[PDB]
């Protein structure tokens, strides 16, 4: 039994700032939710394969959360302190406690390439996001590049992402969107993130054995 309280699976696995006081447990038979948990994806967007993720996390025999890319050390040439008023906590703007909004630093957004190797002798759950701003003037101000790319390469997951700019209806005070994607990484496999903009990089991941 895993009680998420008033948080959805999305808000809990992404690390919504208003769900940090959820007691983590390494083994659960099923997940108990509520009729409509108040806190889900504080930043609007499409959660890819959400139902498949809820099925994959239904029951777990081992579950450890770990820092996959340390914030202070992984992106020295990119700004890392991005926060939003949508994902607020104690009345102050913050972001997902498992993600990182990389933006430009000193007028530049250099090409990044970050690898993670699954040395946990388990399968790790990795989550990231692709940012879809609402206009080109925001794309320039945030990243200083106009034609952004985001690619993820693993043995069993490889995809070139489409960071398209589009003004969507204002939800939670935002006309832009963050599309959330995820994959399960087998032991020994290496996932590689490459981007010149619009990447919501993974900060923490989850090593799980999935009983």
């Amino acid at each position: 039994p895993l009680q998420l309280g008033n948080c959805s699976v999305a808000g809990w696995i992404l690390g919504n700032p208003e769900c940090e006081s959820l007691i983590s447990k390494e083994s659960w038979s099923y997940i108990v939710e509520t009729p409509n948990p108040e806190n889900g994806t504080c930043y609007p967007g499409y959660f890819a394969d959400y139902e498949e993720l809820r099925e994959q996390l239904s029951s777990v025999s081992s579950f450890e959360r770990f820092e996959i890319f340390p914030k202070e050390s992984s992106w020295p040439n990119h700004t890392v302190t991005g926060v939003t008023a949508s994902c607020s906590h104690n009345g102050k703007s913050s972001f997902y406690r498992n993600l990182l909004w990389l933006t430009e630093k000193n007028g530049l957004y250099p090409n990044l390439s970050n690898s993670y190797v699954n040395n946990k002798e388990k399968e790790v759950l990795v989550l990231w996001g692709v940012h879809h701003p609402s206009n080109i003037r925001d794309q320039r101000a945030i990243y200083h590049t106009e034609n952004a790319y985001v690619s993820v390469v693993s043995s069993h997951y490889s995809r070139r992402f489409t960071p398209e700019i589009a003004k969507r209806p204002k939800v939670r005070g935002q006309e832009g969107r963050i599309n959330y994607y995820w994959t399960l990484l087998e032991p020994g496999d290496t996932i590689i993130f490459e981007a010149n903009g619009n990447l919501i990089a993974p900060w923490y991941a989850f090593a799980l054995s999935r009983g």
Partner: antibody
Amino acid sequence: EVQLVESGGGLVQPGRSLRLSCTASGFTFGDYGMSWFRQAPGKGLEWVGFIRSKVYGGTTEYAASVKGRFIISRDDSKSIAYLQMNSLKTEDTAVYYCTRDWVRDIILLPALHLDYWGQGTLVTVSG
Amino acid sequence: VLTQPPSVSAAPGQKVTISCSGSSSNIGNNYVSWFQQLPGTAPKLLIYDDDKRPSGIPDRFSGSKSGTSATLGITGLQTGDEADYYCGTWDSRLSAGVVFGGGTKLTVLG
């Protein structure tokens, strides 16, 4: 309406200190960032510094002209923004204005939505 | 720092444009704001977010940007428009912060 009123300017010797004040009225002060600008007599607009709203950390940014010497703070209980100036030099002599501004959401930059200004106060760094 | 024409002259009722050239750091990728400052007065916000207008600004004032330079347009020229005009923006370089243009004095002819 929105109204920003400034005070504190006056004669001050080089090397001394002087604390400017900017009182806000007619809007929720805690929801806006605040910026100080200055303008030497007949010599164009210059940026002094900027303080974010409490929602965005209440942190500050400063011009290279000023960073080590001036300190910007705010008091949301009294809806007042301050410009604490130290180690003043003669080239700091200018009319100083205060403004309200938006804090951009993700990059936390000032939006430069300086829709409302104070009347300004003159600071003479002289001996 | 941004560069503006020191003076701009135009007759009433004419199209008048003020240039503000910058770099990719400041004007290329950041928003530009335009200000009007009549002699000895607090500046007035004409344009923000490269073309948006705050409340009270008439439709005669417009702004545009293309690459590294930004431009402000005033279409129905009045004698009240005779003032100084500044362009401001953020410079994403390490500690350049808010940068401005030198200023442009608009004189109405006739």
